Swiss-Prot record, chains A, B, C:
Gene Ontology molecular-function annotations: RNA binding
High-level lineage: Archaea, Thermoproteota, Thermoprotei, Sulfolobales, Sulfolobaceae
GO biological process: defense response to virus
Keywords for the protein's UniProt record, in alphabetical order: Antiviral defense, RNA-binding
Note from the entry: Crystallography and cloning were done with strain P2, while interaction experiments were done with genes cloned from strain P2 but over-expressed in P1. The aCascade complex was purified from strain P1.
Identification of the protein by name: CRISPR-associated aCascade subunit Cas7/Csa2 2
Length: 317, 317, 317
DNA sequence: CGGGTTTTCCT
């Protein structure tokens, strides 16, 4: 598994939208529970959903897969991740629906040999014999850091006009500025492995041949998420992003680093990693840290400089 | 016995679901009675059921048991905890049904020598001669703390879309933020001990040999629950969790610590533990405390740092 | 792709306006989150939106296109970029609305062969069969650099009167001064290429013939943005602009240069460019730097003197 | 302006 926590600083941003009222376009907001010296309070803060990040990741994965020669589905070749949900998609791609429970494994292998996206990002088919496949990359909402007593975020509305020589043309757009945080998880030990229980079916040899390439592509795809190629309204509201802190852990057992809420979340996660490897009888535990804000790190930890170095190191091992 | 009270802080969460209405996925809610300065009131608040936690605990126990060589049932090798309820499971596993009341102990031992899950988590078989085994781990609903006059919890709905080039695609998801509390109990003095009354039956020597490993594995399995690996919808709604306060008590007599609703529940439970050991003629009483919010603790109390240290200490003693 | 970061110094400026209160004309202001040695703070600073920059760029593109003989739409011939959104524009230009999804490609090609502005800057038609084309040039707000603990910006108000021989004439104007920074992106590989998926439609041969001229004009149009020809109230409040630092990158793969916030943002982006070309299996990566403040640059970097040289170099390659 | 929840279980 590869687990990570990342902290970003974003200014003058509008990357996720919600239903509009009047001539105003609104930014997504959510309630958060925060702890101050006086107790616990409830606040409303701008957020960014995780499905936009999932879409960006899967689009980059499609690009890399088509570049490197891996198979890509017909519908997903165009950036429409309906996958194989409805029967219309099955008809377009040309895959017979499963007949019974015993036939499920064949259908899963057939779908899994045509589109890498269905293999990595999971899918669901509903019918007489529904077939499920959980995603191999897990994301979450992007929240500003709940540090201290004051939330380091702000939201406002802005005024815009459309010029016309014959007036008979005014709209408002919400803009936010915050210090976002988020964490991610990716289990590369289950890529290119069937999930439905059953007997062996012809075609798994090709999967075993392509396993290494699929894992390499899946690990490569994370560069988009770690770089900042996500969100909408990028044509006229291009944001100003800057990485601040990053922790990545590679292990052989389940593990979850601390959220990027406290100023000291790198020392704690490394100590916890050592103790967890000791207690769970693991055999591999490595840590990589990127720091640009000069906070406490610890001892005996590899320190990197950019994200390309981290991607290369993750690929090599 | 091992009895514990734990306090968590969760933000932007959807971990337990219930039946859906329209295009809206709903979060579990329950009524709670709360005391304010003006009297008593009834409120509707999001909660998380205990059966999700039980499933997470049993899945982790399956993983550890397979890793350490302890026997695991065939159906329970797959993460499907029907245990030995119906006749189909008995036919699959290959165990003869009990004949009379006198044969109940043999059936319990045979079931108990094949699946550790049936041993630790209890089971039921209904028929001509019913057989019961109560669970050795007990859990409860996860509730936000009912401190003060305002409940520190909030629930809202969010708007999501599925993109398509040929419109002919909209759903809503309920998201919560709360300060959750829950308590648990695990009696390790009865693990690998038959429950049905009767005579001695061949095969108990193997259970006596495996008792130590079974107890060790059961104690290890709590790390998943104390870490935060439970609940659904984790692929796109990965939650942000953080521990705040934990009290764990090891005794030789029945005891129940205070619920984590009042800010002073560590001092009270320690005083009660001392007096209860005095009054019930016990011979062992230990307490461990993890504090990360700076609330009153007391004197002469072991203070830990993480949960791995607690797990190691519980294993060693 | 062509991606750039630019730094400017502006004194006594008022280029973007918002709703006015009383006899005071206000300058656009926005919140920004800044990092200092004491933590993170929220501040209110004057800004300039990106839509004014888009209008300036599109006006210059119209001028160049009409000068070089490329087709220009009737409505956009006058500097009114409603494009083909409403039905009145369609009636004026004389293009039939699309009938079904299968006819979308024909409509896109018909619109795309008449006005280069719709081709480069994209457009949208709403109706029974909506048609979309994302802009090929992406801009953002113009924020002052968030360097150090003190923001290098200031805003004040100024007093003015109107003379009259028969009093019965007083107003206030907001004026700012800052060190602005902004970044831009332009992917020239998709200019003069249809975006809607479908079958071949007559008229694409002319598009392929005109592609070279369209790309050349689009590259030429960046001179207005890089020179300082944008914003309003230039008749009486002509600002004093001076270029300070510029980085331009030409690649075959997605890339985003570092924002012009830190004093050392040229070496970092070149190192990242090299590593990214190594990791993403690219085949082209070139950089150009203009420096007039004597900051660190690096080694093996082409150095220019003016912006016209950069424009010529970008055109030639 | 188009689009507004899909199955498989109900002791």
């Amino acid at each position: 598994m590869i687990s990570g926590s990342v902290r970003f600083l974003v200014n003058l941003e509008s990357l996720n939208g919600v239903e509009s009222i009047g001539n105003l376009t609104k930014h997504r907001t959510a309630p958060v529970v925060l702890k101050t010296s006086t107790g616990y309070l409830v606040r409303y803060v701008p957020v960014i959903s995780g499905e936009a990040l999932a879409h960006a990741y899967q689009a980059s994965l499609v690009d890399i897969a088509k570049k490197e020669g891996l198979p890509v589905g017909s519908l997903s070749s165009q950036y429409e991740f309906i996958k194989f949900s409805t029967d219309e998609a099955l008809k377009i791609e040309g895959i017979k629906e499963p007949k019974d429970y015993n036939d499920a494994r064949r259908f899963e292998v057939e779908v899994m040999l045509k589109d890498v996206i269905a293999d990595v990002g999971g899918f669901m088919y509903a019918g007489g014999a529904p077939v499920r496949r959980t995603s191999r990359i897990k994301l979450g909402y992007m929240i500003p850091a709940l540090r201290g007593d004051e939330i380091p975020a702000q939201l406002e509305a802005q005024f815009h006009v459309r010029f016309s020589n014959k007036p008979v043309a005014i709209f408002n757009v919400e803009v936010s500025s915050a210090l976002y945080t988020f964490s991610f998880e990716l289990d590369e030990d289950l890529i290119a492995v069937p999930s439905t229980f059953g007997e062996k079916v012809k075609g798994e040899e090709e999967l075993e041949r392509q396993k290494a390439k699929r894992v390499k592509s899946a690990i490569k795809a994370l560069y988009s998420l770690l770089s900042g190629n996500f969100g909408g309204k990028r044509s006229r509201f291009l944001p100003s992003m800057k990485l601040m802190s990053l922790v990545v852990t590679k292990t052989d057992f389940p593990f979850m680093p601390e959220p990027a809420h406290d100023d000291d979340y790198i020392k704690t996660t490394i100590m916890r990693l050592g103790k967890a490897k000791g207690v769970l009888n693991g055999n591999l535990a490595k840590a990589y840290v990127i720091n640009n804000e000069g906070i406490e790190v610890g001892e005996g930890v590899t320190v990197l400089s950019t994200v390309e170095d981290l991607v290369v190191k993750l690929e090599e091992e």
